[PDB]
């Protein structure tokens, strides 16, 4: 296959959060069939960010989910052309994030391009006050619709001073060529920030994810 047992990626993000413009550049690697990956991201413009890194972390890698042999891998089949995805995140306090992504394959490397816009975060809320400390383990509930894959997640940010801050995620994943469609299925996942400098201008993350039947 095009997707080897070890792969590297490069990522660029252009974004705004409550009108604060920034850019991120990074590189990552992982074992796509084992469902494990890491990335190291750097704020290249608009740092230090006046908001929680956790908003950005799920925007940095769909080739890296472990699939059982009986669930066709929507993303791995799409190569070498790749896929796009688009997402809306709606937080309990009215925060809203729109995200668009392109994934390609160039010079043996996966290439990610991301655009993000967040708005309506309360200025004294936990996102703009950097009061979150990472996402809980999640289950993405996916289903095919014609040639696209749709997924929904109930996501929960841990708050530094106690409790949880909830968001609904809705994503559509769009292969650039026809692939064999899976049935409905779930991805169980955990995303961790494994290292960061004090002002989160340099951040390492780690995801593990595994597809299973409903």
Curated annotation (Swiss-Prot):
Q: Which positions carry the signal peptide feature in this UniProt record? A: none
Q: How is it used?
A: Fluorescent proteins have become a useful and ubiquitous tool for making chimeric proteins, where they function as a fluorescent protein tag. Typically they tolerate N- and C-terminal fusion to a broad variety of proteins. They have been expressed in most known cell types and are used as a noninvasive fluorescent marker in living cells and organisms. They enable a wide range of applications where they have functioned as a cell lineage tracer, reporter of gene expression, or as a measure of protein-protein interactions.
Query: Known SUPFAM superfamilies for this protein?
Result: GFP-like (SSF54511)
- Keyword Protein transport assigned: no
Q: Which InterPro entries match?
A: GFP, GFP-related, Green_fluorescent_prot
Q: What is this protein for, i.e. what is its function? A: Thought to play a role in photoprotection of the coral's resident symbiont microalgae's photosystems from photoinhibition caused by high light levels found near the surface of coral reefs. In deeper water, the fluorescence may be to convert blue light into longer wavelengths more suitable for use in photosynthesis by the microalgal symbionts.
Q: What is this protein called?
A: Red fluorescent protein drFP583
- Native organism: Discosoma sp. (Sea anemone)
Q: What is the lineage of its organism?
A: Eukaryota, Metazoa, Cnidaria, Anthozoa, Hexacorallia
